[PDB]
Structure 1
Amino acid sequence: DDFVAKLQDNQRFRYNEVMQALNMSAALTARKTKEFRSPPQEQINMLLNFKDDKSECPCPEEIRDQLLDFHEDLMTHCGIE
């Protein structure tokens, strides 16, 4: 409930920055906003890709840490390690 709320707020902020920065590089804006032009399921998939160190996702460290902590708590609840 709150993880998605903060993720949505950040995606609004990044889109605002993209729109404000569109006027300096139009060619960049294409692949820069392909993320916002991607389907919502693909958006979820690409923003939830900070597992491992591939790090192509635009998710910031502060939002990443909350999910990395909740995943550890869930794994402990499941008794995995």
Structure 2
Amino acid sequence: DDFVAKLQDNQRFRYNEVMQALNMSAALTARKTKEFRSPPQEQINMLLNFKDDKSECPCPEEIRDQLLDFHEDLMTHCGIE
């Protein structure tokens, strides 16, 4: 619940800044906005690509840390770690 709330807020903010910066960079706009142009399942797939390296994921570090901490706790609960 909370993780997706934060992700949605961050994606809205990044879309707003891309819309602000398209006038400076119209050429960059296409593959900047491809993420918003992608279907929602593929959007969440791109946003969930920071498990190992893969910095192309637009997700910020302050949300990556939340997901990694919860994943560590889940692995500990499952006894895998």
Could you say which TM-score interval applies, normalised by the shorter chain?
over 0.9
Shift of 1:51: 0.9
In structure 2, the partner of 1:51 is: 51
Structure 1, residues 26-79: CA drift from partner, whole Å, max 9, x if none?
Answer: 110000000100000000000000010122101111000000000000000000
User: SS of the residue aligned with 1:70?
Assistant: helix
- Which ranges of structure 1 fall in alignment gaps of 5 or more residues? none
TM-score by length of 1: 0.98
- 1:1-81 map, 5 Å: 1-81=1-81
Aligned-pair identity (%): 100
Superposed CA RMSD in Å reads 0.5
Q: Please state whether the residue corresponding to 2:6 is helix, strand or coil.
A: helix
Gaps of at least 5 residues in structure 2 are none
- After TM superposition, the runs of 4+ consecutive aligned structure 1 residues lying more than 4 A away are none
Instruction: Say which is worse superposed, 6-15 or 47-56, in terms of deviation.
Output: 47-56
How far apart, CA to CA, are the structure 2 residues paired with 1:37 and 1:7? 17
Q: In structure 1, the residue corresponding to 2:28 is in which secondary structure? A: helix
CA deviation after TM superposition for structure 1 residue 25, in Å? 1.1
Secondary structure at 1:31 match in 2: helix
Question: How many aligned residue pairs are there?
Answer: 81
Structure 1 range deviating more: 8-17 or 50-59:
50-59
**TM-score, scaled to structure 2:** 0.98
SS in 2 for 1:26: coil
